[PDB]
């Protein structure tokens, strides 16, 4: 971190708020932290790790992910995408995990969180894999209230990217699951302007964004893959004083590149 530690305070400083970061390069164990045990609102961000927990249950219940969910009008919240199309036929499991991985589809993380046992249920799920900082306490949308101090709803950048590592990379799925939550993140929609826009157009890369709407709050994290060497997992979380404080995508894209240089990957 040494190498870039400089360039991050001033990043940060520029963009007005705070910026937490953890890198891991899976090959070598080395590691770039700024912030990285701090806390920052999940926001949206929530959703991968909530896809992951799908499949981590159907493992056990092969009739989970087929599995039709039919809805009415008044679960259709603002920025549901997908779910708004499928209001008069319902979606499958599988297909809602899919929208709130990749287009952040509220409506169908919301159906989700329900099937899970809510905000407690996902928060198991992250402490039967090791992670004990995670915390989801409420709902979309209240669960993305952003306010300084307040440990609801937050991670840290480091057990954001331990989480991500465990699930796209190790053990916590078993392999056919495994790759199905690579293959969402890696069809993530709504990221092109975040980590990716740091990453080579010729590597692999899968993401997961959040964008709260208040108190400079958005964030990523991403697995990348470098051509010829092992994946990077990472995350970039932003937060801000002041309400009215707007988040900065450049700012996310800039501290992933700063990250990557940390680390000596060649992008
Ligand atoms: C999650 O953080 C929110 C929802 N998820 C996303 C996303 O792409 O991750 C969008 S936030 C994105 C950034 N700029 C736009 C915005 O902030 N809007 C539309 C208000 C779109 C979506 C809102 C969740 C809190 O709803």
Redesign the pocket.
């Known amino acids: 971190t040494n190498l870039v530690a400089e360039p991050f305070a001033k990043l940060e400083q520029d963009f007005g708020g705070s910026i937490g970061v953890y890198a891991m390069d899976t090959g070598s164990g080395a590691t770039v932290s700024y912030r990285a045990e701090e806390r920052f609102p999940l926001?949206?961000?929530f959703k991968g790790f909530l896809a992951a927990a799908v499949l981590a249950r159907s493992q056990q219940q092969a009739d989970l992910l087929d599995t039709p969910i039919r809805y009415g009008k008044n679960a259709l919240v603002?920025?549901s995408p997908i779910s708004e199309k499928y209001l008069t036929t319902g979606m499958t499991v599988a297909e809602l995990s899919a929208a709130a991985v990749q287009?952040?589809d509220?409506a169908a993380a919301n159906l989700l969180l329900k099937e899970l046992g809510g905000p407690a249920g996902l928060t198991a799920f992250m402490r039967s894999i090791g992670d004990t900082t995670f915390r989801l306490d409420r709902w979309?949308?209240e669960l993305?209230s952003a306010i300084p101090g307040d440990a609801r709803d937050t991670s840290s950048p480091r057990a954001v990217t331990e989480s991500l590592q465990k699930l796209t990379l190790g053990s916590a799925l078993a392999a056919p699951q495994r790759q199905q939550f690579v293959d969402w993140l890696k069809g993530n929609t709504?990221?092109n302007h975040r980590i990716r826009a740091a990453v080579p157009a010729d590597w692999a890369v899968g993401d997961?964004?959040?964008?709260?709407?208040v108190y400079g709050t958005?964030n990523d994290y991403a697995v990348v893959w470098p051509t010829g060497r092992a994946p990077i997992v990472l995350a970039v979380y932003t937060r801000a004083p002041n309400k009215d404080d707007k988040h900065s995508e450049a700012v996310i894209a800039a501290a992933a590149r700063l990250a990557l240089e940390g680390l000596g990957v060649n992008g």
């Open positions: 926001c949206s961000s603002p920025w287009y952040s509220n979309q949308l993305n709504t990221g997961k964004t959040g964008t709260c709407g958005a």
